[PDB]
Design a protein around this ligand. Structure first.
Ligand SMILES: *[C@@H]1O[C@H](CO)[C@@H](O)[C@H](O)[C@H]1NC(C)=O
Lengths: 51, 51
């Protein structure tokens, strides 16, 4: 809350580090865009049947 | 009889603060006097509002 707020420099680098990651996981292909939203994913379309 | 009351005006709000001071002048009384502290901020910003 100290005003004016001063951010640390390292933060931007850590953000970029996190956003640039591409890995394989339980959610399928994991990659992010500049805004941090998921990109290149696969959403399985499923139907509940008798069996 | 000084009464401290905080206030928050979004930057770019003018007529509001004007009518605010007019209200202060007209409704002022000998019994007690309100002592506002105005700080202008970005109303959409949660951090600024919290601070
Ligand atoms: C990966 O995701 C981006 C963002 O939606 C898209 O532009 C690109 O075509 C995708 N690549 C593949 C191989 O699906």
């Amino acid at each position: 809350l100290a005003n004016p707020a001063v951010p640390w420099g390292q933060g931007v680098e850590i953000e970029r580090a996190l956003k640039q990651v591409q890995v394989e996981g339980l959610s399928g292909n994991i990659k992010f865009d500049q805004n941090g939203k998921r990109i290149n994913y696969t959403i399985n379309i499923m139907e509940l049947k008798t069996n | 009889n000084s009464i401290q009351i905080g206030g928050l005006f979004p930057r770019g709000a003018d007529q509001e603060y004007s009518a605010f001071r007019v209200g202060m002048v007209q409704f002022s009384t000998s019994e007690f006097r309100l002592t506002p502290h105005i700080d202008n901020l970005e109303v959409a910003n949660s951090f600024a509002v919290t601070n």
